[PDB]
Swiss-Prot record, chains A, B:
Superkingdom of source: Eukaryota
Species annotation: Homo sapiens
PANTHER family, per database record: SULFATE TRANSPORTER
Keyword line: Antiport, Cell membrane, Chloride, Disease variant, Glycoprotein, Membrane, Transmembrane, Transmembrane helix, Transport
Name of the gene this protein is made from: SLC26A3
Name the UniProt record assigns to this protein: Chloride anion exchanger
Membrane topology summary: Multi-pass membrane protein
GO biological process, one term: membrane hyperpolarization
The family this protein is said to belong to: Belongs to the SLC26A/SulP transporter (TC 2.A.53) family.
Free-text description of this protein's post-translational modifications in UniProt: N-glycosylation is required for efficient cell surface expression, and protection from proteolytic degradation.
Extracellular side: 92-93, 196-234, 341-351, 410-446
Compartments reported by the entry: Apical cell membrane; Membrane; Cell membrane
Classification lineage: Eukaryota, Metazoa, Chordata, Craniata, Vertebrata
Length: 706, 706
């Protein structure tokens, strides 16, 4: 192997000069705006088919291969969705039939407007908790036992319509890329904190206690006190039934996860458990024997459309923003999992449009918000879900339960629903193991995780997410805050320049300094960059310039008085009796020491690194060439330019040639916009690589030696 | 000038093997915590000298060179500080003697604990506005005419004590680097919007109208409506006097800065205008002839110490946090303009300590928060101020006014004080020109400017600032969100690789792709990076792997059925035109298509790019080597490393070699912590430069051809 290169030393200017560059009209936004408004027949059809995905996958339906799997997966997911809807309507503190409305309407709208094929659409615990908190805050700020739940149902419907409107607006404006602003560790900490929230929320149903509608901040600790202050009134039948259901459900769920091969269809343990619980609570008469809290009689049928309260809109706009963002984040994560697993495209913008429309229709018809539960999407995909016909059949099962056979869910206890909702928490609760992993790998992401979790538990579920996103954006600045700037030296007498402190037998060319900042320099970076550059070169260029200007002022004062005669050979002095005296420039003239040294008045050049007459003392420097390795400097903001240009100017003023190497052409094109280059700072300071600058320096210095 | 290199082709591993690495100790947190508790004699001496700067700059005082200049500068800045304190006590809506207390106490404390030598310590308009808003909020939220102003004075004192406590705590924990979290454009937009706020807040004194204590959000609009709703009751004498004062002070400040040289000292125009205003108001009896509002009679002397209300602390935690942050940011900016101008070190943590102690003492003695006014600091520096003895003399002048000659300021109108404030406001108002400048230079910083302005005008000054810092952190993500990822190619048959779309006569080695992402490839951009890499290579590695696994499954099915035979020659097909039968794997068996292809059961190689027998079709790829130019990739978070590892594995599985080049030694070391490396994704994929990777590819491929 041999790396044999023989070419000329290239500046960026000399390179672009010798190699003619393909002229490219990069873009404007006028032509982009107009080409975005072409409205060709083919473009109009493409837009109308991207807004109505069912027109594309329904005619391409593979009946023989998909119909039975869709029917089976739909039966399973609908049976699960009925119970999940009842439980999550308990989480919202409304009658439990509105959970069935929330399980019915978004699935039917997403069947038409959605691009995913494997997610089940409906409520999930975190969003039901967020909606319950939003409506408990909306009923509080309201300028004035069945009226209470009626007002709560109205507030839930209005919160749902507003969050659906926000989602639909975000999908129309094509902002479907907001999901990138939530990292894996932020989502992890938020979801395990929310699982702890839900665990705490199910305690009033396991024990059958009466807990107020507490609100954030610190709602979880308020709910814990309300629960364990009454722990002497705990219903024992509710507790025992909930523990039995939770135990059996978790055992059979682990069995389903472990024996996923020998099992043809996963065991529907939730269905069996609720059937058995309702049968034993109806046969043994638990409602009057043990005084348990049961689901009770639900009204058959749907409710007429409702009108959204704009007062609730005003009172909960921010809560609905949080609800819309969490709903989209969760649904897009689950849908992305399945789209990567089955290799089909997933339009994020369409998701927002599909979920917003579903939430609007749901809230209009008295349901509450919901996008996708990973627990129900897994039940749908694991049972053979091939298309969104499984969602249609799940919604048909929900419709059958709403219209015909809801009376069977009358003797079912709320502790059983709470036990199921608690059984679905193992996956999120065991994410506490991410703390140690992230500690090992990346402590900024461990900070995001730990720091998200604390915010969400301490604050609310919607305020915690906002503070968490802000802190996660702050850790990006933490990463690039104190960069490990280094000094480079040549190792091997070749074109390899490494850290000066890392290898033996390196070589720094005399008078040359190579400095590397390993990160994008921004506003929070440039003071540190200047401090480290000054520590690396060994002096402050502005201080050297100021002392040189002081020395030049003293030389002029001593020479125009006659004590120092100018000669083209040197600084001969007729009298060597200089007395100690400083000019003591006042506050209004001291700014004259930062000006460039223009000593062309004297016929000969002053050597500032030699000794000056009459004991005038100036700090002597060895540096004559400063190379800046800008390879890993991705961007420069407005603050970086101002800071860098001023840094460069002082170096240039004290006669130190500055070279910037390792930058691509886009970097220099962007630097041309800041009006960075001028006289005394030109584009000739940019070279290709560190070696290119180093060979230029060597030839310059050997020619100056000649 | 010829660049000639002849070295061996170096992986990172081969370079570490050939060049022995200088062993360096671990900078452990425990040993660092060991140096923390030094208990050394000189260490304790320097700690005490750093906490009490006066013990170091007072003995080193130059009397004959500094004393008279400091005396004159102190006289001038104290005469300015009296009037500024009165005006800012107007801004806080308390009696005007508390502005004198605010101009006295912090200066006397900063004389002892301040590392600056040129700033004038006291209130400035933005902080007086913030303190007044915090006081109005506190009096609003307080659980149930002189009593109203007494309540306001107590709330101001308490808000000040809490602001000082927060500053002192931030200085004790050594967090004096938070000023880096405010860019130049954030500060510019904030100070322009705040100058607009201060302009609107002085209108109730120019016109002499009764405006309620409006509070944010949109307090600027509320105050404008209440002002221009009663614009008919405007006092004409107040407006005329304010306009005359404003015209004169603006003209004379312009004459001052235009003719700095001819004037030995700047013309004191606020003082002269105040004396003339008070004289024509007392002689001509403006208080009874025109019913003008005057400063009134002030209580001669100081007030006894007060105890901070903890109810006010509870009510204004966040308000005082914003006040502390704005105070420190402003004082540090000014202090930094003179440290640099006069070349002395400025400790930020001692700045926080001194400002916090000054605010605590001021609030205890019935003052309001203040750090420094750029207008007053400029008067102190521009008049000859050399040390903080000028601040001591200004505080002595404020003391004289408080105790002895305060009654002279009795007939002075408040419109004159408002006019002085506006004359000082002109400078921050002139920052509207930065909009077009930033528009031309950097549009992310233009966005920071405009959004900071809008957040500060619409929301509060404290909420406006909080929102602004969040959006400015978000723009950092906006920059690195959609990087200009590009494909590279060789120019000149040497080691120069540039954008494939930029020059003519470039060269792509057959089968090699070189991909460059020019940014830290973090959580915001790993999906984008993945998509762009897939667009660059021309295919999806996972899709090719899945179709190859499908083809191999069909091959094994047809070969164990006896339909085809295996031979060292290849596949022998006695039967051709096989019946096409897709296996149609189910949802729980399909992830077997993502497994590595281990066809060692068959003795011969299966050339997946050749023709497969019996109508089997797989996509063919020309790519056999993929180079990733990670030179400008600064950092990688957990999300990046998971996404990056996933991308690499898919490529490796389809037999495409992957090389990562251009990364420094520190970057590879960080990667090891993440456990990125394992079997099949080794450390041998890292090479020094792109040419090193390319020379390795060529030798590998030519050896395989040989
Ligand atoms: Cl779930
Ligand atoms: Cl000011």
């Amino acid at each position: 192997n041999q790396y044999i290169v023989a070419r000329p030393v290239y500046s960026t200017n000399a390179f672009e000069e010798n190699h003619k560059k393909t002229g490219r009209h990069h873009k404007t936004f006028l032509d982009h705006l107009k080409v975005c408004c072409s409205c060709s027949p083919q473009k109009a059809k493409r837009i109308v088919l991207s807004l109505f995905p069912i027109a594309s996958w329904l005619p391409a339906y593979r009946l023989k291969e998909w119909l039975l799997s869709d029917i089976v997966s739909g039966i399973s997911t609908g049976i699960v969705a009925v119970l999940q809807g009842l439980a999550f309507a308990l989480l919202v503190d409304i009658p439990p039939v509105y959970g069935l409305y929330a399980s019915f309407f978004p699935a039917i709208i997403y069947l038409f407007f959605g691009t995913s094929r494997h997610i089940s659409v409906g409520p999930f615990p975190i969003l039901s908790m967020m909606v319950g908190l939003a409506v408990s805050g909306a009923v509080s700020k309201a300028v004035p036992l069945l009226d209470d739940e009626r007002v709560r149902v109205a507030a839930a419907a209005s919160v749902t319509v507003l969050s659906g409107i926000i989602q639909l607006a975000f999908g129309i404006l094509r902002i479907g890329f907001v999901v990138i602003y939530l990292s894996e560790s932020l989502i992890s900490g938020f979801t395990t904190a929310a699982a702890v929230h839900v665990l705490v929320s199910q305690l009033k149903f396991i024990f059958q206690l009466t807990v107020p509608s507490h609100t954030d901040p610190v709602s979880i600790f308020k709910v814990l006190y309300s629960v364990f202050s009454q722990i002497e009134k705990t219903n024992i039948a509710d507790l025992v039934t909930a523990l039995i259901v939770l135990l059996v459900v978790s055992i059979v769920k682990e069995i389903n996860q472990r024996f996923k091969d020998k099992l043809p269809v996963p065991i529907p343990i939730e269905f069996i458990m609720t059937v058995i619980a309702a049968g034993v609570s109806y046969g043994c008469d638990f409602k009057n024997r043990f005084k348990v809290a049961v689901v009770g009689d639900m009204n058959p049928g749907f409710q007429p459309p409702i009108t959204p309260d704009v007062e609730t809109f005003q009172n909960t706009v921010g809560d609905c923003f949080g609800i819309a963002m969490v709903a989209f984040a969760v649904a897009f994560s689950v849908a992305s999992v399945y789209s990567l697993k089955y290799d089909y495209p997933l339009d994020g913008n369409q998701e927002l449009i599909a979920l917003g429309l579903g939430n609007i229709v749901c809230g209009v018809f008295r349901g509450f918000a919901g996008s996708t539960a990973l627990s129900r999407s897994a039940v749908q995909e694991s049972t053979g879900g091939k298309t969104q016909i499984a969602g249609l059949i799940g919604a048909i099962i929900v419709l059958i339960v709403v219209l015909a056979i809801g009376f069977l869910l009358a003797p079912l206890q709320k502790s059983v629903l709470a036990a199921l909702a608690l059984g679905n928490l193992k996956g999120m609760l065991m994410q506490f193991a991410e703390i140690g992993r992230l500690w090992r790998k990346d402590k900024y992401d461990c900070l995001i995780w730990i720091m998200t979790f604390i915010f969400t538990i301490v604050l609310g579920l919607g305020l915690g997410l906002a503070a968490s996103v802000a802190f996660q954006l702050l850790t990006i600045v933490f990463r690039t805050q104190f960069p490990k700037c280094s000094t480079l030296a040549n190792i091997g007498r070749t074109n390899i320049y490494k850290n000066k402190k890392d290898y033996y037998d390196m070589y720094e060319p005399e008078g040359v300094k190579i400095f590397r900042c390993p990160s994008p320099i921004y506003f929070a970076n440039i003071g540190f960059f200047r401090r480290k550059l000054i520590d690396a070169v060994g002096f402050s260029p502005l201080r050297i310039l100021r002392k040189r200007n002081k020395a030049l002022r003293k030389i002029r004062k001593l020479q125009k008085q006659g004590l120092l005669q100018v000669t083209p050979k040197g600084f001969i002095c007729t009298v060597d009796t200089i007395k100690d005296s400083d000019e003591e420039l006042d506050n209004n003239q001291i700014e004259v020491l930062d000006q460039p040294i223009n000593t062309t008045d004297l016929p000969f050049h002053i050597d500032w690194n030699d000794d000056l007459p009459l004991n005038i003392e100036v700090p002597k420097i060895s540096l004559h060439s400063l190379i800046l390795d800008f390879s890993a400097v991705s961007f420069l903001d407005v603050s970086s330019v101002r800071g860098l240009k001023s840094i460069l100017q002082e170096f240039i003023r004290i006669k130190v040639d500055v070279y910037i190497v390792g930058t691509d052409d886009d970097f220099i094109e962007k630097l041309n916009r800041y009006e960075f280059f001028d006289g005394e700072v030109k584009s000739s300071i940019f070279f290709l690589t560190i070696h290119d600058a180093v060979l230029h320096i060597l030839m310059k210095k050997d020619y100056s030696t000649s």
